[PDB]
Symmetry: none
Subunit: 243 residues, 6 copies
Amino acid sequence: NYQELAIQFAAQAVDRNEIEQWVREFAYQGFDARRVIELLKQYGGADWEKDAKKMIVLALTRGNKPRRMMMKMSKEGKATVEALINKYKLKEGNPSRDELTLSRVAAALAGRTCQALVVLSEWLPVTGTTMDGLSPAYPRHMMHPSFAGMVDPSLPGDYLRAILDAHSLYLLQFSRVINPNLRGRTKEEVAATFTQPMNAAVNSNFISHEKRREFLKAFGLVDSNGKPSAAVMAAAQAYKTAA
Amino acid sequence: DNYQELAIQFAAQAVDRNEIEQWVREFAYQGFDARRVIELLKQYGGADWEKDAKKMIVLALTRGNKPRRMMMKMSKEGKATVEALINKYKLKEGNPSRDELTLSRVAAALAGRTCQALVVLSEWLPVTGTTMDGLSPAYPRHMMHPSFAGMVDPSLPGDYLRAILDAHSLYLLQFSRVINPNLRGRTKEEVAATFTQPMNAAVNSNFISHEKRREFLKAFGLVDSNGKPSAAVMAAAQAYKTAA
Amino acid sequence: YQELAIQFAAQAVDRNEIEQWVREFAYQGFDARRVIELLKQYGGADWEKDAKKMIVLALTRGNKPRRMMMKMSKEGKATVEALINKYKLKEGNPSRDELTLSRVAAALAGRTCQALVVLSEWLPVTGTTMDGLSPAYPRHMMHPSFAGMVDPSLPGDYLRAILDAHSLYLLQFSRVINPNLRGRTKEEVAATFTQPMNAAVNSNFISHEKRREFLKAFGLVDSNGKPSAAVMAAAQAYKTAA
Amino acid sequence: NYQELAIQFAAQAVDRNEIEQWVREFAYQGFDARRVIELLKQYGGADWEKDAKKMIVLALTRGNKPRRMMMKMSKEGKATVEALINKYKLKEGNPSRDELTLSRVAAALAGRTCQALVVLSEWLPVTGTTMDGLSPAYPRHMMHPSFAGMVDPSLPGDYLRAILDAHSLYLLQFSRVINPNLRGRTKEEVAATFTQPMNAAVNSNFISHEKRREFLKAFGLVDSNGKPSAAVMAAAQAYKTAA
Amino acid sequence: YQELAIQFAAQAVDRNEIEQWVREFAYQGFDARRVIELLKQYGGADWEKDAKKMIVLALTRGNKPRRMMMKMSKEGKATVEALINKYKLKEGNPSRDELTLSRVAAALAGRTCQALVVLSEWLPVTGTTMDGLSPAYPRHMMHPSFAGMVDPSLPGDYLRAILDAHSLYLLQFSRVINPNLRGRTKEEVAATFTQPMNAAVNSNFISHEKRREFLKAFGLVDSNGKPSAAVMAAAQAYKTAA
Amino acid sequence: NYQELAIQFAAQAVDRNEIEQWVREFAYQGFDARRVIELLKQYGGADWEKDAKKMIVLALTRGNKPRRMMMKMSKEGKATVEALINKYKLKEGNPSRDELTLSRVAAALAGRTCQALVVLSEWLPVTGTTMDGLSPAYPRHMMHPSFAGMVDPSLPGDYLRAILDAHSLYLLQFSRVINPNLRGRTKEEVAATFTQPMNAAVNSNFISHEKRREFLKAFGLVDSNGKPSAAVMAAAQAYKTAA
């Protein structure tokens, strides 16, 4: 008997809290922020912070292939990267958990990466100027995928949606630039490649909700209550009308 | 010649309405045997078959049907739980033999649960409930998985049944475009041709009686006591006709 | 010697002569008579019931019987296995001793077309999809075997209307069944389906009189042969289509 | 010097008669109309004319591969073709000069082939209906490449221009249908494959200018002076705007 | 030491030495002098007649002599075989001491262009095709060897007009002889043909005075050097072209 | 707890100078102007200057593959190039730092290359005439990627942007010509390939800011204050409206 036993299973109702746990457990995990920092301290020692700052600059302006970027670089720079590759055992793409990538270093330390964006605005693959041509006064702090780990999910539904839609305007433009895989794919198709790690970082256990909101407030993205800035709201709408 | 005359004598025998109907259903597309799936889940899982099945639904709905692939970009805890599930239930990818289990088949056979889970998982799905609301206000979350088709009762009045299916087809159209990148420069009619074959299959399948299927739709708030579809359904049904 | 090339044109025009040879030399996919001969031979008294099932099999699941059996119910898979062995069925195009689901549907066009009314929503192109192109599209026109029912003795204007109406489904059906046809123009698509279409209309199987009687019964033409509004609607829908 | 010698020869002026004779001699030769007819009479005898008429129908509707078309054919037809292959030693594609092809038979006897097109309009790879959807009332007499062998080059530049552009509209559509390798190549690229044998037949010595014009008049393509019909002019423009 | 880059850039420009080096380093696909030297050597007194025939052969049938003789008359093939043996003719682009039909046509640019008037309708791009782009297109401009006839001492505006008019043929002819530029923009196509064009335009073979005398004779420029209406028409037709 | 230290790191604020230093250090470097000149003097001796002038002409008109261009060249030219390849150990594409390319010679000696453009205007892959058809009186001094090396970043934001946008109009047209892979990619996609080395040259340490501005003034691109010429402004706008 199998037709009968299938309904009884469906009748068990939904344990909303139980499902929530499983989602978070099974969630996409591009990097473990804790392991990344653990490794940086282990390999760098006291110098872990300075090198991490450099690795952010390296990641944000030259990408995630350190041996490739080293070919088209100054004598001084090529020396500094070679040292970093050997000191932190740096790899390319997405390897094992106990491995470090420039992208992972930038992702785990999103608090600084986003502050750095203000300065590096015109050195990024998608400049702040290119972003302004889509939404006036686009928030520079939002111009890196690591931003998502700076979003507080406890924020009111309408406010949270606004932050994410604003962020996704960059994401959409950045994905098209970094990926030649784009031929002429619709906004909905492109979103499918970047929303998975976005939500992953939005809902991750690393950095509390209270602390993540304090960052957004500091960057001038939300007020004391959590109402997103006009710039955010402008970009969120710019995203809905975009293609 | 002799053959010319004999062919019309066969065509003159008129139509046996019910004769065709049952043959369509017998010869119908069948991507999964719901009974074999449940049989296997109980066999492999024992008393724990239900908890793991619940997890497999979550796994399927949010992370897909390739368990070894999703394991690579996952937490230490999750990756471990999945490895266990792969070994306990001998999980495979895509569409294998009948005696094999896939996360998609587990979600399909236990659609009654999959659809309840969608309400919760709405924002973790490839097409979010928010994306769906931007096409039809208050889109029914219970309709946002292909396994919903096995929930529709075909004994429902023609107008009511059409409304339920068109409403669901709005999600399938958007979902097919997302899950399949080979989409390219096509049309709503071309996309529908890929998803309507398994849709009608699950709609007219022998698994779960007509009476029991309608009771689910009533519970999900998709139809009333008579079977009249909710405003949300009707709204989405029209949203589908005007869609491209 | 050039002179005989001139004397070869002076012979005037002989329309009936050409019209004859065309049909002789025409494209022949199969033999309706041999198909029926073998159905009776293999099937006996049961040839008619199984033929009806084979039509359903062809119309909804295609022409690869061993492939469709993989994604099918326990009951169905069994019925098909029996049919494959009883009628020695094959895929695509085989010998003079084995049948194919497509040939069975094609040879028994009369019933196949009547069956379309019922199976409308199980076909690769549903009746609903067709209505979205031309209102109240004739279901009887929704299979390529419908071509081998069209009476060529019908007035030029009426015959053109019937064919253009069917070509609307053919165009939509070819795009669905063939994935290589991604963005090919209406003119390019037509070139692949018009060759066997004309072949079936001008064929010797089923007389002109008997063919017209079918069209009348399906409600496609009246007593004189004037096509229905639905046909005329679809015929124009085809000219404006791309 | 070699440069002061170059001009002395460069400037011996022009005499068309000498350089004309050479083009005729060196011209593209897809088939020799005279040898084709010579063989047809040799192989057929009194029956050469009836079989030639059939070979035209065979060529126009079923192609140039006789053994291939025989596979998908009626018992009666297959029997007639096998009887033609043996009697006229028929081959495929483009062989030696002393060999016959269905295409060569249709090409050498252009005068009939074009008259036959009116009847066979809906049996051709590109139907008259398909042609009308590009230019209204397209001339059926122009729907075969052998049509070029009926064109009179002594016609006024503007009139000759019009006839060829009209014909080319068919040639462009027909080449796409007969050749699958031509997926989406531009009108200019397609023209390059069919204009070489077109001009070859157009300027060929087989049948006189006066006799050629008499055919065009009979087909209703030009008037007593040689002015092309509205249908021709319509198709000629339809070709320039085509892609 | 890190500053002697400006000291080098301060040395100003010498239009004479630059323009000389540009001519030196300039592209070359044949040596006109060696070609003529060899034609006289192989041909003797008959070098001129055979060269005239080779021009006809090149302009209408291409640069593969053994390939073209296969699809040709008995008389022509014979003439072609004789030429291949008398002048040791090769295909494509070989060594400097080798002769190709293309090289013979190129070196005797002055003949080739006069021959174009006659051969207009036998060329890969007919005069008729050209007239459909610019009315009364100069036939003398319908070969790349016309480039070796352009006088660079001509006023800037007049010289540009002559070249733009010619480039209208080079654009249409490139597309025909080359399936490379499937849907390549006018700017991309120009990049492949302007390199050998300029080479022939500013080469030491044929003086400025002698090159202008040819253009005058062909009716391309007047006594002062003002280009004909037909040239001016084609020059503009080129700017608006794509 | 790693979560705590992460904020302590993100609290250290941003030091604009530290970051900017690392940027230039890690910046893209297609060539080292200093090493190029060092080797030219080393290999060429007193003749380094004349050969460098020739190598500029060679690069600008015949490309960066010396052994390839040598095949389709005069007897005299081919000899001069062979000598240059052997004297300066010339290589193709982008090799090691201690190697020379015609492109690198042109790039390092940008001051002359740009002056030479005026003369060589009609010998370039994109002619001055082609450029005028996009913006009237297009500055020839801009028509080589090595011009990016003569731009002074200390120039007012508005003036600097104008100079670069003007130059980018050439860059967009030139990239489409030299690269066949482009086909029909948007202005934004094309810009991505050329902006990286462009900025690299602008913000490079080779040549002082004061000396670079003096070049722009001399070329007639900016006035005493630095205001860009009408031609520049015209081309700068022509770039924004371009596709």
